Amino acid sequence: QTLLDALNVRVVGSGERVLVLAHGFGTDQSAWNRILPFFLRDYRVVLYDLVCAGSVNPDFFDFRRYTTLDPYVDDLLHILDALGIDQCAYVGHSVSAMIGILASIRRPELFSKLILIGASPRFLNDEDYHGGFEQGEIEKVFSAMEANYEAWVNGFAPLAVGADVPAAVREFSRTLFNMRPDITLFVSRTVFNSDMRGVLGLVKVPCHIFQTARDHSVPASVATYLKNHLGGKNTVHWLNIEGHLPHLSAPTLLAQELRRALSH
Numbered sequence: 001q002t003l004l005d006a007l008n009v010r011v012v013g014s015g016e017r018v019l020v021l022a023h024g025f026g027t028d029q030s031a032w033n034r035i036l037p038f039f040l041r042d043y044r045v046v047l048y049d050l051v052c053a054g055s056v057n058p059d060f061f062d063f064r065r066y067t068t069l070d071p072y073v074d075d076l077l078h079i080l081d082a083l084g085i086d087q088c089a090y091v092g093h094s095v096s097a098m099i100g101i102l103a104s105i106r107r108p109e110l111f112s113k114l115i116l117i118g119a120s121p122r123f124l125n126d127e128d129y130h131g132g133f134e135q136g137e138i139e140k141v142f143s144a145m146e147a148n149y150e151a152w153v154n155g156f157a158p159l160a161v162g163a164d165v166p167a168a169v170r171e172f173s174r175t176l177f178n179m180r181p182d183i184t185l186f187v188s189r190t191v192f193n194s195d196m197r198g199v200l201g202l203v204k205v206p207c208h209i210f211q212t213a214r215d216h217s218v219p220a221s222v223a224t225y226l227k228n229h230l231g232g233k234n235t236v237h238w239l240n241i242e243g244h245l246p247h248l249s250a251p252t253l254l255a256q257e258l259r260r261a262l263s264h
């Protein structure tokens with residue numbers, strides 16, 4: 001309840017089947033605003049802000065606590081428990097895809113289905129795995145973020161959005177720039193340091209892997225990697241949408257594909 005208030009938990013919709021919409025990096029739950037009308041009639045929609053969102057009081061971001069994805073999982077599960085949800089479909093963008101995977105391992109009965117958008121188990125390359133990022137280049141990026149956060153945001157937002165959708169670039173920039181810079185850097189380091197590859201096989205619920213074209217954060221091969229290694233029944237949806245934030249850039253088309261995946 002203090003947690004429900006802290007993370008801006010919102011429940012809306014006229015349906016019964018519970019649908020959790022969990023935003024990812026650089027946004028808050030408002031990233032779902034243009035998807036939402038498509039689900040109100042026949043779902044009960046649960047939204048929340050990750051503790052690192054710009055819309056959450058930065059006093060709640062305890063750097064001694066949030067050192068791995070596990071405490072983010074704790075927050076998600078405490079929310080669903082407090083709302084009395086014992087089964088739901090879960091949609092996770094970006095880091096929230098991994099949070100949902102870990103949550104499902106902890107609570108295998110809680111999720112009927114996971115829908116993963118812009119998901120990667122590991123951003124960094126190594127000998128037998130392409131993630132899309134080298135350690136050396138990422139340290140240069142972290143230096144830039146520290147030196148001038150504003151300039152970093154304005155360089156990064158068009159890459160993340162990917163497609164030439166200026167409204168979405170401005171909207172992503174808005175919510176990224178609302179994040180306090182030391183939180184953004186710390187969260188970024190957290191996730192670049194994370195490696196979910198070893199746990200993927202532990203998942204037993206069905207996963208729908210939504211993969212856009214030319215996703216700055218997620219090579220096509222990573223979607224295929226998820227398909228091969230996630231332990232349950234997996235379906236890749238190769239969206240006809242460019243970029244890492246399809247909910248911001250192509251919400252009408254994304255909404256339709258989410259509806260199809262949820263009906264499957």
Ligand SMILES: Cc1c(Cl)cccc1Nc1ccccc1C(=O)O
Binds near residue numbers: 025141192
């Ligand atoms: C790609 C990237 C850079 Cl280069 C720097 C800083 C951040 C990102 N991204 C991310 C960091 C944490 C969690 C998710 C993401 C994501 O992209 O979905």
